[PDB]
Structure 1
Amino acid sequence: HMLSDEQMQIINSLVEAHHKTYDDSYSDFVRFRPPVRRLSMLPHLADLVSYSIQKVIGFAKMIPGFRDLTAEDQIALLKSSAIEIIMLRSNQSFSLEDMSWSCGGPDFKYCINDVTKAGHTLELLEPLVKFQVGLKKLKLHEEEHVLLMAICLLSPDRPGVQDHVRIEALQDRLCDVLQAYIRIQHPGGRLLYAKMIQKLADLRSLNEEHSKQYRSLSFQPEHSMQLTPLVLEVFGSEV
């Protein structure tokens, strides 16, 4: 029927957080190693991924209650979900006209052939694009896109997490917010929330295929030396 004060505040800082960690002009991309079209795009794309990981953390540090989880749970959540939040947040640069991420002119317009030259096979990129297409096609609001990312970050079923009772509770409070938001403030879409939860299941499958290609890549020194320290730490198997 209505949104509560606590729930309006959960929405406000989530939207603000995303605004503090997402630049719709992509003006920092000039500071990355330049794109080159055997894996000539890996330097740039590792730098892009490493940048975004930093972004995903600053966002995560502002999700209500994340800060209060023990350090090991904050780490466990960010380690398993980071790539999924990157796929989710990447949707803002994806374009249906060109079927690509358009972060700039010809340099920063990333297509499937490009991400191939960063070491990823069709078996991951073919679902990723279809996920991007269907996610764009839901025409989410700022408030829903940002709830979706926080709901993804707070999944209790990640390897490593220890206090899955409390993480469960934080994620259900956000699912309450999203469901209330969609009903009160989203004219259409009675089935939209069920569709958004489906998108989470898709990202789990994306997460698994990525992990395999990344494990294979990270284990090859000629390629792992083109990665960044942060990428190797967040996507790597340490504890």
Structure 2
Amino acid sequence: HMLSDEQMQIINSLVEAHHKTYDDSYSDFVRFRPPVRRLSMLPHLADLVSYSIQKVIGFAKMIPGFRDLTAEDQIALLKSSAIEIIMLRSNQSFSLEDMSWSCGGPDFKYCINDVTKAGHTLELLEPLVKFQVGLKKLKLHEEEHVLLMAICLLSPDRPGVQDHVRIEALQDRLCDVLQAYIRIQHPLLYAKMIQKLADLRSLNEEHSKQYRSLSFQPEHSMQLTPLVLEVFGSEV
């Protein structure tokens, strides 16, 4: 029912790492290819995701103990979970009032129909919005939000992971840190957030399906970015 100094520094490190890698102004969005409302939104949303992958990579490298894993394990964790961290970190820009991601003005307001114009269907998008709504209703503290992202990233049950025991140890430390934080700050919540990680596994599965079909169409794959082709690609 108390946080140790080492647990406190882990929280401080993860929150500061998130502030370094998440810009609430969304001012870098003007450097993306402009949004257009076949697959007219694909250039903009590909630049958006590729930008976010860079931010997730930066956030991951500042998770305490992450840089001590082997480089191959760091990459395997990133490739398998990048889309889950992006969906998770996107909750900050999601809004319950209009059910969309608002990253500034109307140009950077991403409705469900916009992502339809990036090659995705309702099978992915309807559960994704439901995930955003259920996550938004939890009213997570910033400490809980960033701890959930770090826990999701350090899941050992990913393809290509070698040192499954060390990643398990790191994730357990973060789960312990998170469980002690929830105890102190709240009067249930831990189980719900762990359930959100199971939702992300399902969203990940559906996205990779729709991305794979998208990436094999040359007129569309040429609209992606080099980083998106690596992270979401099949080669390893």
TM score, norm. by length of structure 2: 0.99
Equivalent position of 2:177 in the other structure: 177
> Hey, what's the Cα distance between the residues in 2 that align with 1:100 and 1:60?
26
Residues 145-165 of structure 1: per-residue CA shift (max 9 Å, x gap)? 000000000000000000010
> Hey, what's the Cα distance between the residues in 1 that align with 2:104 and 2:77?
31
Residue 61 of structure 1: CA displacement?
A: 0.1
Quick check: 1:203 aligned with 2:205?
Answer: no
Residue 118 of structure 1: CA displacement?
A: 0.2
Residue 104 of structure 1: CA displacement?
A: 1.1
> Hey, what's the Cα distance between the residues in 2 that align with 1:147 and 1:186?
16
> Hey, what's the Cα distance between the residues in 1 that align with 2:220 and 2:160?
27
Residues 147-191 of structure 1: per-residue CA shift (max 9 Å, x gap)? 00000000000000000100000000000000000001234xxx1
Deviates more, 1:211-220 or 1:178-187: 178-187
Residues 127-162 of structure 1: per-residue CA shift (max 9 Å, x gap)? 000000000000000000000000000000000000
Residues 64-107 of structure 1: per-residue CA shift (max 9 Å, x gap)? 11101101100000000000000000000000000000001110
> Hey, what's the Cα distance between the residues in 2 that align with 1:42 and 1:164?
36
Residue 112 of structure 1: CA displacement?
A: 0.3
- In structure 2, stretches of 5+ residues that fail to align are none
Corresponding residue SS for 1:25:
coil
> Hey, what's the Cα distance between the residues in 2 that align with 1:202 and 1:234?
20
> Hey, what's the Cα distance between the residues in 2 that align with 1:30 and 1:4?
43
Q: What CA RMSD, in Å, does the superposition of the two structures yield over aligned residues?
A: 0.5
> Hey, what's the Cα distance between the residues in 1 that align with 2:185 and 2:96?
26
Residue 58 of structure 1: CA displacement?
A: 0.2
Corresponding residue SS for 2:101:
strand
Residue 25 of structure 1: CA displacement?
A: 1.1
Equivalent position of 1:50 in the other structure: 50
> Hey, what's the Cα distance between the residues in 1 that align with 2:7 and 2:186?
15
Quick check: 1:72 aligned with 2:72?
Answer: yes
> Hey, what's the Cα distance between the residues in 1 that align with 2:98 and 2:63?
33
Residue 238 of structure 1: CA displacement?
A: 1.3
> Hey, what's the Cα distance between the residues in 2 that align with 1:121 and 1:146?
29
> Hey, what's the Cα distance between the residues in 1 that align with 2:73 and 2:66?
9
Corresponding residue SS for 2:21:
coil
Kindly indicate which of the two structures has a greater share of residues assigned to helix: 2
> Hey, what's the Cα distance between the residues in 1 that align with 2:64 and 2:212?
32
> Hey, what's the Cα distance between the residues in 2 that align with 1:183 and 1:114?
40
Equivalent position of 2:92 in the other structure: 92
Corresponding residue SS for 1:107:
helix
State the 4+ residue runs in structure 1 displaced beyond 3 angstroms.
Answer: none
TM score, norm. by length of structure 1: 0.98
- In structure 1, stretches of 5+ residues that fail to align are none
Residue 111 of structure 1: CA displacement?
A: 0.4
> Hey, what's the Cα distance between the residues in 2 that align with 1:222 and 1:186?
51
> Hey, what's the Cα distance between the residues in 2 that align with 1:206 and 1:74?
22
